[PDB]
Amino acid sequence: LQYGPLAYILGEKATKKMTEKSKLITVDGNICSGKSKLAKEIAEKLGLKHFPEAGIHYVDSTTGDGKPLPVQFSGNCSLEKFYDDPKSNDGNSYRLQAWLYASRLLQYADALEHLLSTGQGVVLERSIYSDFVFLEAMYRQGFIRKQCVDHYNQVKKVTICEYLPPHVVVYVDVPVPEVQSRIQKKGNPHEMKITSAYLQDIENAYKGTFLPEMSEKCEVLQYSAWEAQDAEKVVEDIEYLKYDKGPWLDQNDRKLHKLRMLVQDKLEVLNYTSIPVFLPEVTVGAHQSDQVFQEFTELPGRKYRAGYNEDVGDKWIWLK
Amino acid sequence: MLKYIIPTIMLMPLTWLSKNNMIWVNSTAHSLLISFTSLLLMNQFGDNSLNFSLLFFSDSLSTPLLILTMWLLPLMLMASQHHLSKENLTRKKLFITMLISLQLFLIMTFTAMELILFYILFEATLVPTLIIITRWGNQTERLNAGLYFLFYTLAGSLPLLVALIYIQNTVGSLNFLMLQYWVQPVHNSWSNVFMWLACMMAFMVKMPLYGLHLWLPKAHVEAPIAGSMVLAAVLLKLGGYGMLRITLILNPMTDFMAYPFIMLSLWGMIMTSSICLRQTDLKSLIAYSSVSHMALVIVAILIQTPWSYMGATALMIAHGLTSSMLFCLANSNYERIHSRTMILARGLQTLLPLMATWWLLASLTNLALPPTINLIGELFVVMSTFSWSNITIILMGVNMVITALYSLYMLIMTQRGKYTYHINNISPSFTRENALMSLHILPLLLLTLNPKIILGPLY
Amino acid sequence: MNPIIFIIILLTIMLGTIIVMISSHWLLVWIGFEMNMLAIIPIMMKNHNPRATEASTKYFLTQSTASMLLMMAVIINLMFSGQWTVMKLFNPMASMLMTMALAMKLGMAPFHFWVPEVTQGIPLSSGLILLTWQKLAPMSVLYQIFPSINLNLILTLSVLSILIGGWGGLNQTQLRKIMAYSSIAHMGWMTAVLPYNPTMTLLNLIIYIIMTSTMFTMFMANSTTTTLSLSHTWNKTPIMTVLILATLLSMGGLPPLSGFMPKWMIIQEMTKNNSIILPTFMAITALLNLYFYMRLTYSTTLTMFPSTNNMKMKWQFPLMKKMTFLPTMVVLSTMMLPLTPMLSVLE
Amino acid sequence: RWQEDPEPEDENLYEKNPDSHGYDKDPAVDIWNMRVVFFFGFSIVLVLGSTFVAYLPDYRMQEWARREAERLVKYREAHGLPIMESNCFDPSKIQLPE
Amino acid sequence: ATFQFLPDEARSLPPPKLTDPRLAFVGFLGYCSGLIDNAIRRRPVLLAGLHRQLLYITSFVFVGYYLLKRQDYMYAVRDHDMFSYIKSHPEDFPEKDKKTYGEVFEEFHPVR
Amino acid sequence: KFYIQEPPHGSPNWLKVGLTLGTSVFLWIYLIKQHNEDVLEYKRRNGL
């Protein structure tokens, strides 16, 4: 019984499956803050589902066979190109950013659909609430145009308003000199081209805008790099939270049913990420999009709705 | 007519269930077979028409129009398959489906017994034609060409619907066989003047009448080659076929209501012939040439004599093959130089010898060299208009001079002189293109051996 | 809204309409309209935003005013005939008041200003109800009182609606406003033929509802409310673009599609009554509708408008909206002309 | 400005297939398309169609009418009747007004 | 009758044949609906869910048959009412005195 | 197992399939029975 009003009427109400362990946790930080490692330990210790940070190929991981697709089917967004040539005339910088916000929006919907359907909490690394720090850094460094920022805010305005914020926001605060040292040690040739000014912009946006905003409506825990090493103390901090803020206290079965109907319908989730605002960075001409869409339908198991693809082994198609 | 309607419908599953690479082979082969069977409609009798059922009938007017229609579908498929090569499969099959649906509407239109059934199929042809122009034309102007084509037609056709429904209320039937016997004379009144106009204007726009012809040069310059072929060859003749039938019930009012339209046509044919002398677009020149030729057909239908009705029928068939051939000739150049400008590529006889021969033969039929059926049709109209009034020979003779000048100006400009130096992609004529031209000219010239089959009922 | 409550509210919208249709007493007709208006407001308000609140208020003021005028007509009718039976009215001033009230309820010109605004301000599913189910009850009363309607009044309303609907739609880029002006134009055909043959009124109403439901359902399927948003359909659901094309041409009255049938039949009935100028004027004026229907086909199906990069993410997910009855309605919306003689079932 | 594909180069069919008939890139499909067009277009429709038209059984009664005219001319001249009369219809079957 | 789809008097008329061409068209419409249902949901158009495609045809035919029954009955009633009225009022529908074309004067309009 | 997430229509809904075919069979049996009963009543009423 795929979830709907009928399933809701018959007793599939979110408050039944939810507990005081049903929480949405997001770990934030600058680049190379060990936030990935902290996020895994929190999930393991608290028995939550861990979501690796949503990258360029997150949506591929959730559809088809789950393996990544060729680049042209993500529009040719390259994080490596962003580092090598952040000011490329092709518009890769904002096109990557617009794609990544949509990837995070989809992931936030999956995480919320997991929380509401099973009751198990989730741990995310960054979210649609903190995606803007990279946009602010890009703009302040002159990588993207003012019009791109306006487009981003338009898309964020009509999308983020539908979703509840995280229960707990965890911030791992690492200074830019230490961030810059860990980057050079990580030995990724493109990442080492990152400059401290860009990194300082991310930090400023996090502390100037993100943390004050999330503090009003969420539980914010901030750890230095050293303190994040003590994951057990981090988990201990989380379990002693009062939770006396935000909209999660206003939710009831009727509102959570409306929320679940949204997050399960992924096209409804992504509706406004393609608003017809003709920004050159994200606009694709008819001939190209027609050609790429035709190639996409030729990929294995993509021509038809899932379960109706004989070319990947589906059977009983004439009774389905 | 079910022996033609049903196999025409079957072309659609044939095209959709074909192997991906055989859509052109299959659709072309079987549309040619359907055309072969169309010759069975030549069972015509001296007195009675061939009356199949309560819905469909065929007489000597609709028979040649049917055979032309079913002949053109395979030619259109051959003409289209090159510029559609890069189109994806589903969108090719949709294009072929529109062509088949147009043929289905056309054969039913030319054989409908009841005038309201004729009206509905007469109007259904707009949809596939409009879709073909606006979806598969190349230029921005195709969207505007679709709108002009659509609303010029409906502006006249909606009044025709009211008039036809009014006639059925008054007479009790719109069956054409019934109307042959229950027809009553039309008396002078302002009511009948507007009844006359509602009955004729829709057909005048489709011919097109001079002054209501602006949509036509737009539609051709923007349509793809198959759209141009059926537009020129058949769709214009819906108007001529419409008047030839509906004029039965408009007498004797046509005695004087024809005057404004004969004047527009007699003067219009000279104006549109002169226009051809200064056209810079080759497709636009051929389009204006159609307006001039159809002006004769309008005059022939309006003066209502046995000789003028025979000339009108022969002219409609002859112009169908000639004009469609000329568009195909112009398109073959366009597929190489990707421009319709006449003066761009010159001296092509030096580079494409055999194609220049098709150009010569299409030109000679266009200027009505005797004894082509082009000349037979035009001469019969000249003979009958002279009896209408001797002075018309001045206008008809002048138009013959101008027609030769622009027919041969087009030949001389593109085929003769010196070739353009920088145009170095004029590859040799393909077998497909040569076969396409021969399938126009050969039947056209073969008809000179037996003209009676394209002279209509008055023969 | 709680799903069980939504169902009960929807059932009450229908019950109010059914009471109007089965009632033989003017008081019960009035009650049906009041019950129907009570239940419709919550579905206009259900998305809680200032535009929805403005739409519901404008709707409430229009409908409550019309219902008071209807009650006044009923009471005048009571004083001059001493009975309540739903039928011809026995007073010309009562007839005018009831006709004006039903015109306001239908959103006919010059009482049309609320239709484009209310439709714009409510969700697509609510607009679908407003422009289809909500026409049933007022039309079913006109069907019964027409022997006493003033001919000049009803035909003036019809002519004005066709003109205002055609002209008003030319200037719209919002899909909900286009459907609203299209609805105003189509109400004009329904009422123009009512004095002559009410069966053709029913035929035009039924075919109008089928075609309108098809358009709204296809708009909902893709969550499109603007012309430009609809122009992205070709890059997501090509099949939908073709269905929209067929439905729009049908709504334009082009043969051999279904939407030609009501115009065809209405012209026939009017000419049988020696009405020639009015049908011709109506048919030409309806070309304005065809124009802004064609504009939509151009930007949706017959050309390929520019896309966005994020559209590729949508390629990986299937349509999940219900699209209830869409396959059936699109076939009826386009392929019914060969069955035209079936209209006699409406006698 | 935007992300659009470049216009593709024009492709000469003769380059890859010097024997191309111009119907298809695939040489086997190309040959079959040529054969059906030529066999059905020229061998069948034009030749047999021309033959069929040539032998139509007295199209529209022209030959019968000539034989019938000969019979009437022979009969009328032998019996001293006019070859043709001005009145198509017998006046004894007509009543005039007034 | 009153609010009756097919009144009892309709049973005196021949039923539509199950091979009625109009009923075949109705079945064809149901088949087209089945294919569009596959298309809009991106299933293999011709093969997917033959059980669903079968019910589309059956539903259309089933409803179409009863609609065709009511259609023919209404037209039979129209003719019944018309002829009975012509009989009830013979004064308004007299037999016209017919004259042959030899007696009827028609003006001739030459085309010269 | 190709799909990473099991598709909602991976396997046929046999109850729905059984009801769908059963409904189609019922309507055809009912329709033929109704037509047969209609033909006889017509022949009886008209004396044929």
Ligand SMILES: CCCCCCCCCCCCCCCCCC(=O)OC[C@H](COP(=O)(O)OCCN)OC(=O)CCCCCCCCCCCCCCCCC
């Ligand atoms: C029976 C008697 C009554 C007669 C009245 C006339 C009946 C006709 C109206 C029937 C209703 C319309 C139903 C049309 C079904 C359309 C299905 C189709 O043709 O294919 C759609 C096509 C599929 O594309 P896709 O989803 O990607 O799947 C293939 C993979 N490429 O999608 C595409 O690829 C996009 C194609 C580009 C757009 C081209 C549009 C021109 C073709 C229009 C065809 C429909 C005709 C509509 C107008 C009616 C014509 C008479």
Ligand SMILES: CCCCCCCCCCCCO[C@@H]1O[C@H](CO)[C@@H](O[C@H]2O[C@H](CO)[C@@H](O)[C@H](O)[C@H]2O)[C@H](O)[C@H]1O
């Ligand atoms: C109870 C009523 C049900 C009525 C159903 C009647 C028709 C049933 C048809 C079932 C078979 C459909 O067949 C299915 O679709 C097409 C058409 O054949 C096939 O694949 C197709 O590929 C191309 C076109 O794309 C063509 O070569 C050809 O049309 C076919 O090979 C599929 O490989 C097959 O799985």
Ligand SMILES: CCCCCCCCCCCCO[C@@H]1O[C@H](CO)[C@@H](O[C@H]2O[C@H](CO)[C@@H](O)[C@H](O)[C@H]2O)[C@H](O)[C@H]1O
């Ligand atoms: C221009 C060529 C067109 C090619 C068309 C290709 C399709 C051909 C279709 C052939 C149809 C033949 O159809 C069938 O022919 C036979 C001859 O054996 C006829 O047989 C009959 O002909 C006549 C009928 O008055 C009588 O002599 C006798 O009753 C019988 O011989 C049938 O009446 C006819 O039903």
Ligand SMILES: CCCCCCCCCCCCO[C@@H]1O[C@H](CO)[C@@H](O[C@H]2O[C@H](CO)[C@@H](O)[C@H](O)[C@H]2O)[C@H](O)[C@H]1O
């Ligand atoms: C491209 C545009 C084409 C425009 C074509 C214009 C054609 C004009 C045709 C004029 C003839 C119209 O029809 C003519 O109208 C006059 C009224 O004025 C009618 O006059 C009628 O009413 C008058 C009363 O004033 C009576 O005196 C007269 O006995 C009676 O015939 C005539 O019965 C009819 O002969």
Ligand SMILES: Nc1nc2c(ncn2[C@@H]2O[C@H](COP(=O)(O)OP(=O)(O)OP(=O)(O)O)[C@@H](O)[C@H]2O)c(=O)[nH]1
């Ligand atoms: N331009 C841009 N880059 C992003 C965005 N999110 C992540 N990235 C990049 O993704 C890369 C890796 O992300 P991180 O998780 O922060 O680095 P990490 O070292 O692997 O993980 P941690 O140790 O926890 O910090 C970085 O180079 C980021 O620049 C974004 O929204 N915009």
Ligand SMILES: N=C(N)NC(=N)NCCc1ccc(I)c(Cl)c1
């Ligand atoms: N009110 C009108 N002008 N028209 C009208 N309904 N006339 C009644 C005539 C009629 C026509 C068709 C049928 I079927 C039936 Cl049974 C009766």
Ligand SMILES: [Mg+2]
């Ligand atoms: Mg990381």
